[model samples]
Target: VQPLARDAMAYVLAGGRGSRLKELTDRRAKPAVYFGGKARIIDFALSNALNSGIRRIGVATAYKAHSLIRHLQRGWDFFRPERNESFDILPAYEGTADAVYQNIDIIEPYAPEYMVILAGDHIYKMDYEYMLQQHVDSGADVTIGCLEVPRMEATGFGVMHVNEKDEIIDFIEKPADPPGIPGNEGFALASMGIYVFHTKFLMEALRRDAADPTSSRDFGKDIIPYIVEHGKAVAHRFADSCVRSDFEHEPYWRDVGTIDAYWQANIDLTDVVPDLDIYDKSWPIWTYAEITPPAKFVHDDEDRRGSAVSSVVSGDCIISGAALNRSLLFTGVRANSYSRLENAVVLPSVKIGRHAQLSNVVIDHGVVIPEGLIVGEDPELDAKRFRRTESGICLITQSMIDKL
Candidate 1:
């Protein structure tokens, strides 16, 4: 028999400064940024929720949420509010816990048996129903979605040590040296920032954390640890429980929180066989459909051929005699003749002039590159002209171009 669905609700946390992303998040929330050529970062989370059979959902937004709000209105307005199956955007709050705590009144009326909290900035496909099933089976107050990663990489995430019964015995948030799983040697279980909680337990925990003045008001840092100590918490292995038929990188989850990480994630899609399969029609990633015409590649003559090799180009893009290799071009991007882009991410509406070259770069929306302009060629010169990350990914914004 299929598991119950309407008894649970999903609360997506979409507010964060995302300072490490720099120019990418300057005018929009991190979740509003485009990913996989067409969908926004938040689309993965919302898609997972809807695909998991959870219909009632809420998104808490802050930090330049205009773009995200508009995207939701345009794409996800199909949910009927009259049936109480609505996709509502809650007002901004101070922190993750605060975001949920402040919106308690909104969720209280629904009276869902379980509350599924999700981080909106991850790139992965998951059927949260599996985790919800585990949560219900274990009868735990909270269940954290976890993945077994290399011990070296586990330090960057919240590591959990669970007992034989899979109940969390200890929790450490971004420890300097993560402890490997017993008998597993080089692997450690890391949290995916996904939490499923019993409604009553979650409400009490949120209130307690909100009242604590010293609390950081975050799940990994404050709420999870407190719940682990006071209430029953378990770890749901993502590899075993996540619903995916194609098991080609079975537990594929990426946290594109930094510039280099974000760039590499997009570049991964250009691989002959990508780790994240955007073409999986069975598990489609939802997004706003652009009404623009299909992408065009003009100029077929020698030395002026327009082509994109190993790249993902979206609708309304016009590649006019330009070469795009290993890049992601969003909607309405236009590249003139003799322009070349390699290992780059070009946002919507960006115009690249003739003879311009961009490599290992990320161009913000609405920025126009001038003729013969070369970026990502000289480290020092690029640093002086644009914002360059430690991994040498050049970030170009309109203000940086105006200053030049």
Candidate 2:
């Protein structure tokens, strides 16, 4: 059978304050945040859509979305309308369901058979065509993507109670006492914020909610629970559609919303066999390719050799007599002589002065580290000038650097 990607309209929700990230979300939405030294968080969802053969896609944005919108304009604006393939940007709306409610006009043009809803803040690789095919094969009214999480930690997600047939018996959005799997009391089935619905069903369902102004209009809150209770609903295990770096390992997915999570995701990339493989050509994670020269390393002398080991360095980065170990450096980063960095996640266009020593730090874009600066070794010392996370990952921004 031919792929169902073209028959579906994929909607990527690219809105979030991600307040847990602190200053990272101050300038851009969480979806716009940098990841793996090459792509935004939203790029994962957008790339998954295209890779799955879905040409009609819409990116819904809000919450300081200027940067995310710009990224979309630069990289995702190439779809040809004449071919019935369009990439659209739905303007911000107050509520999640309300956003889709207001953009019904845009979706009406294509009149697709299926609707795919995805969140833009997580890190993972998936093939939506598989999920769509499964949804159709099951003859279900709705299919929700889900994974198993520790029951103790499942309070934050939309927890599901599944029967023997994998049908949803109940779904509660962020329940205080989340129900665990029937046999495995230690684990709970949690939603990954991925959904597939019959277009006709969702449109009518959304229309009904539009009349009630009191509803929050969220999928986990207003939509899933009602659908499971009233309509035929099934669960799609994430492992079934997950794209892994290797066949031997388990699937990898992360919610990179908090400071510690964001930092750890970057650091994990430097591993020998990373859980999330950006190097897999068969399942590539596409993003905006900024125009810049190749990354360069210069100078070689006693204690001042420019070198990087087990790291990802993006375009136009210059390491002049500095050493980077297990770090991820974004575009155009410049490290001067005698500076040493370890386990660092430095954003675009940052400058590191001579003799600066840093570790376990997430430096925001365009920040300049002062000469002889020492950080990440002393928590109190670093906290005086920067925001230290619960895990002691220091976040330094341009303004924070200026004050020091």
Candidate 3:
């Protein structure tokens, strides 16, 4: 396949229900969840697309299309539509392959040589054009982006074996007995669910896969494996040495699918030196920033001054001498005096009362934490009040607060 002479089109898979994420995805799409104090997970992918010189992109939405559509309208409004440069979202997708198949009738008219397919709910940064170039250089019918992840965690991803030439010899989706990469011992090259396809080839393959009854209709489960079995598909190694230091030599890619993974990914940013750097101006993440006043820390008395220690506190937040360790305080969150927050993530506009203790919990948006409440070290009790994840991380939703 030849490289796209003009700007290529990107199709982001934002259609999944993300049932494992429970309360977070209950009201909104998975891609819209706030991460790293500022950006959503989908911002990483979209920012990569824009920075890679691909303006014409389509976000595939099926379930909760209204929320996803509203989000894109505010966040992706930076891009203008013209004959040459266009950025838009595509609705009315049935399944993953069907999503692209639905757009084939409209997108094919653009005459794009390469088609980029990406997952919306992933957190990573990459120059997608480089992968597209790699595909064009190899002249393969399809190129699947591959990254090295721990073999123990391979069950969550589509693991595969590729030769030195980066040609995928075998592919499997979450096999019980996973195959290990030769010499890499405990690691395997896993599919990032990012793919580059020849325009015409993608159209035909997607149409065929959509019609197959046994197909999962997803890229990892149905499309990639089928392409490897039926067509000439190669793997493009995703190396992050030059990107950021934390992702250098080895990249930091995460699928925040489950409640535990989602909670942990949010907490990872609180580290002084987090592996993922959201502050990097070169790879700026795009998000819908609400118009609000700047965060302020006030002093009501000499003994009580509003402050947060060792946490990512964004704008519109007020800290009243609270001790927050390893937490994410989003916009407009208020922590009253003497409250203690540890290993917790509080979404926007949440109010934590004085002397409240919150630990190892995820408090959703627009909740008011009652005074003198303790939420930690009691999984059984917290489970009754909140949705306790498999890893014992309590997820507090807005309705939970309303019920309280």
Candidate 4:
């Protein structure tokens, strides 16, 4: 395989309203939402790119991009623009490919040999240079990164049928009747919506597809299928890559596109040993964690019996003797005395009043639970006020408090 040029640039798809996450995305971009203790969802992708020596990145933003833009400006000013190879936030132009296509005028001036296309919301550790090497070795027009996901979950992703050489023969975008892998029942290789396109070929395809009125202006829906049918492109499984880093082997990729998925992924971190290792300093998840005094958990006095144990407690946490277990407590979150919070996520600066019982619930940021409120135990009652899933996990928001 030919050596990959050091000038490969990256473009992250950061637009999309993330409507499935409901109230969470109502104010912020999906990538800007908090995850684990301190990092945002897009941090993983940006960390991967930075660690992989690809310094030039363009984050394509739209739909509630104000917060996202602010986040990039505050936390990601590590690169200098005058150097030419720097970090930038590119807003939405038209379609997915067109977004990048429109920026081609500026991006191409950098003279990148390859373009790394990705969705900002996905959580994974990937080295695009290695993927680009595979693309170069295959001599294919494009190399699409794919992974083996459960068949039942395949409805939301593009499922592909590749030959022994890993050349895609058939592709289905979110089909109801998904074709499964032969022996892996209930499992199929699916697109990760990540791609490595040769710079020149990508330039031509983007221009051609943008002109065609029938084109969907997306990579999977139009570009890949068009290249596979009319041109030449290959689908490369993510597992087949040789770049094995902590982020790559940790099995930590998550598509937090839905409220349930987002909530579940956050809760997964509080486990005894989560699959996604947030503490790996070798691959730290970058984010905009406000510099503040240490997170404090004070002991319960007199009659209050609550204390935090075996969990991640972030800045300015005031535990008024509330008992907390197997959960994450964000900045300035207060748990009043005698309150029991377990198997839950308390967002930043939320105040849990006295004797409040919260379990298997997610409290949004800046909320104040009324005194003696009993949530999570009563699904029917919690459902009437907040959003409840089939599993009876209650979602409390600031708006719900106004109705009370």
**Candidate 2, 1-404: lDDT as tens digits:** 77888789998888777998999899899999989887988989888888888999998898888888989999887899999889998766756787788899889878999999998888888899888998999988889999888887889887888886779999877888888777777888899989998888889878988887777888777877778888888998888898776632778888986899899988988888777777788888778886799989999999898999998899999999999999999999999999999989999999999999999999998898999999988889888989998788899898888886
Runs of candidate 4 with Cα error greater than 4 angstroms are: 1-5, 82-84, 181-186, 241-250
lDDT of 2: 0.87
Pairs that collide in candidate 2 are none
Please give the CA lDDT of all the candidate structures.
Answer: 0.87, 0.87, 0.79, 0.79
Worst 10 residues of 2 by lDDT: 242-251
**C-alpha-based local distance difference test score of model 3:** 0.79
Which stretch of 10 consecutive residues in model 3 shows the poorest summed lDDT?
A: 240-249
Which pairs of residues have clashing backbones in candidate 1?
A: none
Model 3 steric clash pairs: 306-319, 306-320, 306-321
Off by over 4 Å in 2: 175-177, 183-186
**TM-score list, all predictions:** 0.96, 0.96, 0.92, 0.93
**TM-score of model 4 (CA atoms):** 0.93
lDDT of 4 by residue, 1-404 (tens): 44463667888888867777777777888888777877777787787787777878888988888888998888888788676567878875567888888788778778788898888888777767678877888898888888877887888888887665778778998878777765665777788888898889899999999999998788878888988888667877777652344543445568877767777888887767776776767666677777788766666577665577667788888777788887888787888878888877888889998888888888888899888888887778888988887777777888987798
User: Over the full model, what C-alpha lDDT does candidate 4 score relative to the true structure?
Assistant: 0.79
Counting clashing residue pairs in each candidate, in order, gives 0, 0, 3, 3
Instruction: Compute the lDDT of residue 238 as modeled in candidate 4.
Output: 73
